[PDB]
Design a binder for this molecule. Structure first.
Ligand SMILES: CCCCCCCCCCCCCCCCCC(=O)OC[C@H](COP(=O)([O-])OCC(O)COP(=O)([O-])OC[C@@H](COC(=O)CCCCCCCCCCCCCCCCC)OC(=O)CCCCCCCCCCCCCCCCC)OC(=O)CCCCCCCCCCCCCCCCC
Ligand SMILES: CCCCCCCCCCCCCCCCCC(=O)OC[C@H](COP(=O)([O-])OCC[N+](C)(C)C)OC(=O)CCCCCCCCCCCCCCCCC
Ligand SMILES: NC(=O)C1=CN([C@@H]2O[C@H](COP(=O)(O)OP(=O)(O)OC[C@H]3O[C@@H](n4cnc5c(N)ncnc54)[C@H](OP(=O)(O)O)[C@@H]3O)[C@@H](O)[C@H]2O)C=CC1
Ligand SMILES: CCCCCCCCCCCC(=O)SCCNC(=O)CCNC(=O)[C@H](O)C(C)(C)COP(=O)(O)O
Ligand SMILES: Nc1ncnc2c1ncn2[C@@H]1O[C@H](COP(=O)(O)OP(=O)(O)O)[C@@H](O)[C@H]1O
Ligand code: SF4
Ligand code: SF4
Ligand code: SF4
Lengths: 49, 118, 198, 338, 98, 53, 161, 172, 56, 441, 51
């Protein structure tokens, strides 16, 4: 729905029906900005890691 | 055509589309891409370290333009505000996670982009 | 080049003791001409230009310098001809070029001056062309040219309490020192430079 | 175990010093300076803290000690969990402790907790972790079991517990440290500015003081890290000369140009009021108690000369920090330019 | 003098003063001014004056000595100041009590 | 000289004052080296101004 | 205990300081144009109660929007120190974050965080107007929550100590 | 004289007078002038090493005359005494005393005058500009120095001292 | 030089003061009307529709 | 009216107290953190009664070694520095850089010339720059809502930028001897036409509150007046040179035109007074005329006529053809003229042609090889004559690349035109010069 | 009368010093006629190609 709101295209996701978006087996559920949270991006070798 | 957050895509089979040709690294005007590659045990030509410094990178799109297999794509995500400078040192893990999450919209845009020349 | 063009031979006709070396190329505009001018006559030539009838309406559009000492033909070396302007770059320490535009003749005139002395001495023309002040300040600070009889030699676009000529090919883009904040001094300090190599 | 520490001190912030250090209690006055001491040579620094308010400049400026990818801040630290200490010091070969009872605290239980429990848990965690090469606990000069000050009373037990748990621990006993953000020169200036007529004393002002510069303290820490034999010994740090409270007031007044004026309040009534009323930074019982007590370097333990640091004299060191607060009397026209 | 130079001489003309006093550029120096043998500031020649006054004259002996030195030493080595740590000679900062 | 009062013209130039008057070093410097000062030369006038200040 | 009165007053203070969040009128490079775009009607900044103030004394946020040069770093440090507390810092653009396009330059500081404590970073070059709005709103939420992030422990009576 | 160093560029001593009712004077040598410097004409060409040395000596004299004011305004008097700063800048000049090119010497003098003007006008920061005044081998007077290295390597060659110190991080 | 042509601001609308700009406005509106008429006559608009099977 | 010369000027006589500075002048640091200052200007101002006397500008607060970095990097990777130089003429900076590169190569961008992008988008960027300049000038003078009104149109134009290239700012769109024909779309042209039609409303809204306002006229008229001689001496160009009345435009120059401008019938405006009011009027008229230029450019790629039936004498419209949707066809002229090149471009790519793959690999590994030589190519950017002087040594990197920016020359005259003016007239002058320090430094 | 003090020496200054060749320091204020500014009628000189 990000693109639909941004008006990039007029297609929107449709649950349980002919969709305009590919659904691969390796996809992961969308997550909001996880910064300022313990589940944030920690570079490998960083002191936090 | 909007260039947001760098991400790494995969083939529909799940294999990495990125091959260590370093064209994106060479084209990166800001030298924001660091790539180190070693042969995979199966023998594939795949990178072992692919880092993008989001703070050092200018969101130009030369990486995606120079990618010959559409591995690196600047997806539409722009709400990537970070509180710690280390959080902006995007790694291969971060890029692959972003690509997995944003594959639908990225693929939808790529369809139209590829069909435009036709 | 389907235009009406005439060489700026007035300068060399008036200054009878100088030899003429002029060029025009399709790489430039149809009305653009390059010429070689000696440094010891540069000031007098600018004086003549600033108040000659047809050259009266002349504006100094641009001015800069090139470190020709490290200039090398990387490709098509054998294609070089003795008439090319590049032949003068080799073995010459610096090459300062000025570019003016004349309205009466609807022309562009560039003058190239070769500096071979190690100190890079050349007479300034900011007393003739007002806009040349900052241009020459920038050229001197970035390339180390020692302009003479210049209105203002103070730096422009360089940091305070620093001496350097970054645009020289010897200088490295990463610089020689970095500015950090010192808590012991509770203020911004400058220390040696360590950077990232791609 | 081995107390050797191989690190390179010839590099700047972007170099690799070879020190990985965890600094507990770095949100205090001396914490940022101690952290920057290690950070500016390329060392990695961890700052575990549970500070209120989080957005305070004291917490914020800790990130400047080392830089990006070298300084880390561990928020919401739990001081009664051993797992938290283990995580904090997992990858650190140096463990510095500055967690001491604040001058704002009068509760004996809280002071004892801060000065004993946290220090003992840090020492135990360092003992558990075999990679912790060096431990540096910060005690206070004049610590004694008979000391009236609860802070010193608890700090003596804390240093004893640290020595018991980690025999290779190094204990410092700095005297009154002064600096831009100190609690001595800044407190003097702020008290004189808030009263405008006097500084309120509560004793004869005969107590001895031996001030030392925070930069000198940081240099002492660096020298202690460099010296392997400094492990397992107690150091008392102070300035070259000893001054009484009255002499310190006189020196500050002479340097700043402000005429001195000391207003005396009876010690008993001052103590009663401060112990029966709420205490904050500028009004606390610890200051009243320490006014009479002497905080100087004794010969019972190693001195700064052993660390090979030459502290600067107090009159010379403290002059720069009082330039702004200078009496404006009769001055020359040239000086009027400023 | 102002009217000879060309300054405005009327109230309505006062609004174009800058075009006559400041906008006009100054004539560039003659090139002969760049060839003067010496550029030292002018001072009265104190010949025939008392020795006390001559004491204020420019010191030509220093110029002669400098010329002799530079003739004797056309080329010298670059001085290097040792950066090795040395204990301060003036120990007052670390040894003063008051 | 026309319009300059008692000032009179010599062989090599025109003076900056009346015949018997004294020449001014500061005025000579202003005329010859207008706007240019290699260094702040401390003349007797400058030293006396400093002393008065 | 004081907590009974402190906690509701803490919430009120956080709400007020979040609602009134005045940044400093300070722009150095192209990111200033994006800041002005975020100020103007299309994404009305006033909707979230943020109004720019010229003097640092009357500013709550330091928007480091643009490249920082060695010749300017003392100025940025002085502005940050002179800004009245409490305050937060938001770096905007690649140049302000980590040197951006000029990280390999001899004049540009490799990041404003070397001179100032950066509370938040907004990646981009230039960051979009919506990107800056997102960064500002996230900073506002963090600021509101900073007053009480569950530091003090609860005793048997559920009162923090 | 229409120059920043002109005798008329002094700061008046009063709103209605210049330092007296019977005389006119002001200080412009040991403090900055009244009007800012709009233009700094290049040093007139020096045809002799004698002239170059005279220019260097005059510049150093001006720097020595101005150093106390610079120290007072920048609050760096504690770090080093006025004479100490003079001696440090003298060592700096000595390091460059080998120059034998009048044009280069003139350019250096122009740069020195520019930086001195910046120091006068506070264009530079005290920490940034004190690098020229700092002692070459003596500790800063406002800090306590560490003689641990000297004690450890007493009566040992600089080569051995550097060998023990190292010149590369040992982690990598 | 000898027959100067000047643009004079004399009305609220600066376009009206110039005959050319009035024609520019009229041409723009005419183009918009023509496009609208053509699209209305056609009665529908083809569009590109994403198809997930494109990524087999 | 009587004379006031003595009350208006005060000369200085040698060693005279009365003819001297009897006051301690105010040495203020105008900027860098000053709302009037763009943010990286440190102007030491000598005020005496709030009237400027002496200017000492420091402009190094935004120096970044852009030329040094360009020399370090190859040709292609140095292009975005030209976007960074000017925050409101990035398209023109890219156009100048690409013009220089293609002049070195000895070729021209026929694709761009026939698609008309390099002229219509240059005019759109000119509208952007003029809008921002006028808005900032009005804000400095005191008018507030003009900034919002102009920035709405700026947002629309940036939306067009993003639609054509995906970046609302720092487009990095133009490149030498190459054009992204796919991005160019007819619907984009239609939206640009709608924007052009609606832009008259914003122009009139600003003009009503600015042009005829007595306060605005008293603020601008007769402030900063300078003559053609001053323009000539200080090398003023663009709006200031036209305010000088020089009648100097590089777009309509026989030997200096660089795009389709020389074959479009548009008008350039000049004023008989060289003051801020005339400069503002010139900027407004240029904004208005950019609409006409864009309209002509779009019409150059439009198929207005259609097949007419013999029997009915009415248009025969294709029901199932794309041309019925729109009347503007960007690829019309390109396909009509360079059919072979267009077919090769649309048929051969790097995924199926070995030569295309090799060209792409080399292009993105080491920039295109440029024959050694010296060139100077200039464009009429909104702020004046913006030029690039490039010397190439035959490798994939430029040996030297000097940038002649009109902003530096425009800022040079600021002391000259604002000496005797007040502080308000100076904050008006800094806005009227229309300077952005990115290209200055 | 107060202005006459600064007016005294201007005659000799201009007589003995060239106003153009010599660089003499001075300060001035620029005046505008408010009535003319308010009564001014905006106008520009349009330029087109030859016809
Ligand atoms: C209306 C109904 C009708 C009936 C009448 C009822 C009564 C009407 C009264 C009308 C007058 C009201 C005046 C007060 C208004 C409110 C303000 C206030 O309370 O003061 C706080 C306010 C806090 O200071 P601030 O300037 O706001 O702080 C600025 C920054 O915080 C400082 O920033 P900084 O960075 O500089 O920080 C430095 C550090 C401080 O700087 C330092 O580091 C040095 C100081 C540290 C120690 C501080 C200890 C406290 C010192 C008390 C000073 C009192 C002033 C008089 C001193 C006289 C000594 C000879 O700052 C602080 O810690 C701030 C000071 C903390 C004070 C805490 C205690 C305040 C409340 C109790 C005061 C009791 C005083 C009684 C005096 C005698 C009365 C007879 O000012 C004071 O502290 C002075 C108040 C003095 C007047 C008290 C009036 C009430 C008590 C009177 C006696 C009982 C009633 C008798 C009448 C009965 C009739 C029936
Ligand atoms: C509009 C709202 C106005 C609110 C004003 C509140 C005034 C202060 C109220 C104090 C209530 C105390 C209740 C009993 C405490 C029991 C604990 C105890 O041991 O008592 C002694 C307490 C405890 O202090 P202590 O230092 O002796 O001991 C600490 C506690 N032990 C020992 C248990 C660890 O101290 C006092 O004297 C009373 C508390 C003083 C608190 C001072 C800070 C007040 C902060 C107010 C914040 C709200 C501001 C509102 C205005 C904002 C405007 C923008
Ligand atoms: N004058 C001096 O500075 C002297 C200091 N010392 C010693 O040096 C240490 C460092 O100096 P300085 O910075 O001045 O001192 P501070 O009082 O500023 O620092 C003490 C630190 O311990 C933390 N702390 C206090 N109580 C507790 C607690 N109960 N649980 C957890 N953390 C706690 C404080 O954090 P928080 O902000 O969260 O409360 C703070 O970070 C002192 O603590 C003291 O032991 C010795 C002699 C003189
Ligand atoms: C306020 C902070 C200001 C900091 C300024 C920093 C910038 C300084 C600029 C560079 C200054 C120079 O090196 S100017 C360099 C000048 N060059 C020379 O000195 C060469 C000729 N030397 C001599 O004439 C003598 O050796 C001499 C040493 C003069 C006397 O020695 P004594 O007869 O023996
Ligand atoms: N969809 C289109 N795209 C590009 N050019 C077109 C298109 N339709 C028509 N043209 C152009 O129109 C001209 C032919 O006109 P016409 O016969 O009326 O069109 P058509 O036969 O396609 O309906 C040619 O120049 C052709 O390139
Ligand atoms: S957007 Fe440009 S600078 Fe950023 S990673 Fe991609 S190619 Fe590199
Ligand atoms: S991202 Fe693309 S260009 Fe970069 S290494 Fe991978 S395949 Fe090559
Ligand atoms: S990060 Fe990008 S947009 Fe921001 S100042 Fe730097 S170059 Fe400009």
């Amino acid at each position: 729905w990000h693109g639909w709101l941004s008006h990039q295209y007029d297609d929107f996701p449709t649950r349980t029906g002919n969709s305009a978006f590919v659904k691969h087996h390796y996809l992961k559920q969308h997550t909001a900005n996880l910064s300022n949270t313990p589940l944030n991006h920690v570079p490998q070798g960083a002191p936090q890691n | 055509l909007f260039r947001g957050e760098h991400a790494l895509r995969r083939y529909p089979t799940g294999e990495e589309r990125c091959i260590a040709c370093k064209l994106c690294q060479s084209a990166c005007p800001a030298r924001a891409i660091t790539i180190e590659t070693e042969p995979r045990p199966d023998g594939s030509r795949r990178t072992v370290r692919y880092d993008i410094d989001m703070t050092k990178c200018i969101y130009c799109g030369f990486c995606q333009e120079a990618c010959p297999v559409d591995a690196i794509v600047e997806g539409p995500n722009y709400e990537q505000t970070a509180y710690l400078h280390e959080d902006l040192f995007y790694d291969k893990y971060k890029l692959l996670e972003n690509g997995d999450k944003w594959e639908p919209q990225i693929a939808r845009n790529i369809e139209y982009l590829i069909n435009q020349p036709l | 080049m389907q235009n009406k063009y005439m060489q700026p031979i007035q300068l060399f006709i008036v200054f009878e003791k100088l030899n003429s070396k002029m060029w025009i190329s399709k790489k430039l505009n149809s009305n653009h001409s390059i010429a070689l001018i000696p440094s010891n006559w540069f000031y007098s030539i600018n004086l003549f230009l600033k108040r000659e009838l047809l050259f009266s309406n002349i504006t100094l559009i641009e001015n800069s310098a090139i470190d020709t000492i490290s200039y090398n033909l990387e490709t098509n070396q054998n294609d070089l001809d003795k008439t090319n302007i590049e032949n003068y770059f080799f073995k010459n320490k610096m090459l300062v070029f000025y570019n003016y535009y004349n309205y009466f003749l609807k022309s562009k005139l560039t003058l190239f001056i070769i500096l071979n002395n190690l100190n890079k001495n050349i007479d300034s023309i900011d007393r003739i062309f007002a806009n040349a002040n900052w241009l020459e300040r920038e050229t001197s600070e970035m390339y180390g040219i020692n302009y003479k009889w210049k209105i203002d030699t103070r730096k422009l676009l360089l940091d305070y309490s620093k001496i350097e000529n970054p645009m020289l090919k010897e200088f490295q883009s990463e610089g020689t020192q970095d500015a950090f904040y010192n808590i012991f001094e509770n203020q911004v300090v400058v220390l040696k430079n360590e950077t990232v190599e791609l | 175990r081995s107390t050797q520490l191989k690190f390179y001190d010839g590099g700047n912030r972007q170099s690799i010093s070879g020190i990985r250090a965890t600094i507990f209690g770095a949100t205090g006055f001396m914490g940022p300076y101690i952290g920057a001491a290690l950070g500016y040579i390329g060392s990695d620094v961890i700052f575990p803290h549970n500070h209120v308010y989080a957005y305070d400049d004291y917490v914020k400026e800790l990130k400047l000690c080392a830089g990006s990818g070298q300084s880390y801040i561990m928020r919401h630290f739990n001081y009664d969990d051993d797992n938290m200490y283990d995580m904090a010091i997992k990858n650190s070969n140096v463990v510095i402790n500055l967690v001491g009872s604040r001058l704002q605290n009068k509760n004996f239980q809280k002071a004892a907790y801060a000065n004993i429990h946290v220090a003992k848990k840090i020492a135990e965690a360092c003992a558990r972790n075999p990679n912790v090469r060096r431990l540096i606990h910060f005690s206070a000069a004049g610590a004694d079991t008979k000391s009236p000050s609860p802070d010193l009373h608890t700090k003596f037990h804390g240093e004893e517990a640290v020595l018991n748990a980690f025999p290779n621990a190094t204990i410092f006993r700095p005297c009154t440290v002064y600096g831009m953000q100190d609690y001595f020169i800044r407190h003097w200036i702020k008290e004189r500015d808030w009263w405008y007529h006097f500084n309120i004393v509560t004793d004869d002002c005969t107590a001895k003081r031996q001030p030392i510069l925070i930069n000198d303290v940081a240099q002492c820490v660096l020298n202690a890290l460099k010296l392997q034999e400094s492990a397992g010994q107690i150091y008392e740090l102070g300035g070259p000369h000893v001054y009484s409270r009255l002499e310190v007031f006189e020196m500050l007044a002479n340097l700043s140009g402000r005429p001195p004026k000391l207003a005396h309040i009876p010690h008993d009534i001052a103590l009663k009021i401060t112990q029966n009323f709420y205490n904050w930074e500028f009004f606390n019982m610890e200051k009243v108690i320490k006014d009479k007590l002497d905080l100087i370097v004794t010969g019972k333990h190693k001195t700064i000369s052993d660390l090979y640091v030459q502290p600067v004299s107090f009159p010379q060191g403290a002059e720069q920090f009082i330039d702004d607060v200078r009496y404006r009397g009769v001055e020359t026209h040239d000086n009027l330019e400023k | 003098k102002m009217r000879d130079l060309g300054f405005p001489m009327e109230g309505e003309e006062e609004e174009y003063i800058e075009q006559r006093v400041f906008m006009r550029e100054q004539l560039p120096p003659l090139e002969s001014e760049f060839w003067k043998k010496n550029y030292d500031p002018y001072e009265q020649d104190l010949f025939h004056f008392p020795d006390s006054f001559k004491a204020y004259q420019q010191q030509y002996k220093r110029y002669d000595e400098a010329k002799k030195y530079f003739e004797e030493n056309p080329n010298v080595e670059a001085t290097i100041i040792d950066r090795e740590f040395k204990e301060p000679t003036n120990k007052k900062p670390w040894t003063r009590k008051y | 000289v026309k319009g300059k009062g008692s000032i009179r013209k010599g062989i090599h130039g025109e003076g900056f004052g009346a015949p018997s008057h004294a020449h001014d070093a500061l005025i000579h410097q202003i005329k010859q080296s207008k706007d240019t000062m290699d260094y702040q030369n401390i003349t007797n006038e400058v030293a006396q101004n400093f002393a008065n200040h | 205990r004081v907590d009974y009165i402190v906690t509701p007053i803490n919430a009120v203070v956080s709400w007020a300081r979040q609602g009134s969040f005045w940044p400093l009128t300070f722009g150095l490079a192209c990111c200033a144009v994006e800041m002005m775009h975020a100020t103007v009607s299309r994404y009305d900044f006033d909707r979230f109660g943020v109004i720019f103030r010229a003097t640092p004394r009357q500013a709550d946020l330091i928007l480091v929007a643009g490249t920082l040069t060695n010749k300017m770093a003392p100025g940025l440090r002085r502005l940050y120190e002179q800004t009245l507390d409490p305050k937060w810092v938001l770096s905007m653009g690649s140049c302000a974050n980590g040197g951006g396009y000029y990280h390999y330059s001899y004049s540009v500081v490799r990041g404003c965080n070397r001179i100032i404590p950066v509370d938040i970073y907004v990646p981009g070059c230039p960051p979009t107007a919506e990107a800056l709005m997102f960064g500002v709103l996230q900073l506002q939420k963090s600021l509101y929550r900073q007053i009480n992030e569950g530091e003090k422990k609860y005793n048997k009576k559920d009162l923090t100590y | 004289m229409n120059h920043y160093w002109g005798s008329s560029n002094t700061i008046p001593a009063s709103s209605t007078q210049n330092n007296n009712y019977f005389s006119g004077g002001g200080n412009n040598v040991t403090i900055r002038g009244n009007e800012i410097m709009e233009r700094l004409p290049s040093q007139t060409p020096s045809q002799n090493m004698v002239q170059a040395s005279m220019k260097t000596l005059r510049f150093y004299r001006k720097f020595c005359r101005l150093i106390p004011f610079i120290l007072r305004i920048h609050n760096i008097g504690t770090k080093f005494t006025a004479q100490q700063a003079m001696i440090n800048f003298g060592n700096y000049i000595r390091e460059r005393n080998h120059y034998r090119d009048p044009g280069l010497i003139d350019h250096r003098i122009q740069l020195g005058y520019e930086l001195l003007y910046e120091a006068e006008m506070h264009f530079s920061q005290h920490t940034i500009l004190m690098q020229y005044l700092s002692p070459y081998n003596t500790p800063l007077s406002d800090r306590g120095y560490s003689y641990l290295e000297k004690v450890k390597y007493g009566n040992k060659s600089k080569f051995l001292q550097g060998f023990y110190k190292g010149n590369k991080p040992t982690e990598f | 030089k000898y027959n100067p042509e000047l643009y004079i601001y004399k009305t609220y609308d600066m376009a009206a003061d110039d005959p050319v700009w009035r024609q520019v406005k009229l041409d723009l509106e005419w183009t918009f009307e023509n496009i609208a008429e053509r699209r209305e006559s056609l009665g529908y608009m083809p569009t590109f529709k994403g198809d997930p099977n494109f990524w087999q | 009216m009587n004379r006031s010369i003595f009350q208006l000027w005060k000369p200085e006589s040698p060693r005279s107290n009365v003819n001297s500075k009897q006051i301690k002048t105010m040495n203020v640091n105008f900027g860098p953190q000053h709302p009037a200052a763009h943010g990286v200007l440190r102007l030491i101002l000598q005020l005496n009664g709030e009237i400027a006397e002496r200017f000492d500008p420091h402009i190094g607060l935004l120096h970044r070694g852009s030329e040094k970095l360009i020399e370090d990097r190859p040709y292609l990777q140095g292009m975005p520095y030209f976007d960074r130089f000017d925050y409101v003429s990035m398209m023109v900076q890219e156009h100048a850089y690409c013009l220089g590169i293609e002049s070195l190569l000895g070729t021209t961008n026929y694709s761009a010339t026939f698609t008309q992008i390099r002229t219509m988008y240059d005019e759109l960027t000119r509208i952007l720059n003029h809008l921002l300049a006028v808005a900032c000038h009005a804000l400095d003078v005191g008018s507030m809502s003009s900034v919002f009104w102009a920035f709405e149109e700026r947002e629309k134009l940036m939306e067009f930028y993003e639609r054509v290239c995906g970046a609302r700012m720092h487009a990095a769109f133009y490149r030498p001897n190459e054009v992204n024909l796919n991005a160019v779309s007819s619907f984009l042209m239609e939206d640009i036409l709608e924007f052009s039609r609606n832009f008259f409303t914003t122009l009139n809204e600003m003009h009503n509150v600015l042009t005829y306002n007595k306060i605005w006229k008293q603020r601008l008229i007769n402030i900063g007046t300078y003559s053609f001689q001053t323009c000539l001496d200080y090398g003023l160009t663009g709006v200031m040179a036209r305010s000088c009345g020089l009648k100097r435009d590089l777009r309509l120059s026989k030997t200096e035109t660089y795009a389709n401008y020389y074959y479009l019938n548009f008008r350039s405006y000049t004023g008989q007074h060289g003051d801020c009011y005339d400069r503002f009027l010139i900027r407004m008229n240029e904004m208005c005329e950019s609409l006409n230029i864009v309209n002509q450019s779009i019409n150059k790629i439009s198929k207005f006529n259609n097949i007419v039936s013999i029997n009915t004498k009415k248009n025969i419209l294709n029901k199932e053809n794309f041309n019925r949707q729109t009347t503007v066809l960007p690829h019309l002229v390109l396909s009509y003229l360079n059919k072979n090149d267009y077919n090769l471009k649309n048929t051969k790519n790097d995924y199926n042609s070995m030569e295309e793959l090799i060209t792409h690999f080399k292009y993105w590994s080491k920039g295109l090889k440029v024959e050694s030589g010296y060139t100077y190519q200039s464009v009429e950017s909104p702020k004046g004559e913006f030029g690039v002087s490039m010397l190439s040594d035959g490798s994939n990197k430029p040996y030297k690349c000097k940038v002649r920016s009109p902003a530096l020359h425009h800022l040079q005259v600021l002391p000259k035109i604002g000496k005797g003016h007040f502080l308000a007239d100076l904050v008006a002058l800094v806005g009227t010069v229309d300077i952005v320090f990115g290209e200055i430094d | 009368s107060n202005k006459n003090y600064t007016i005294v020496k201007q005659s000799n200054l201009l007589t003995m010093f060239d106003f153009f060749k010599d660089f003499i320091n001075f300060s001035f204020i620029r005046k505008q006629d408010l009535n003319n500014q308010t009564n001014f009628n905006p106008s520009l000189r349009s330029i087109k190609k030859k016809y």
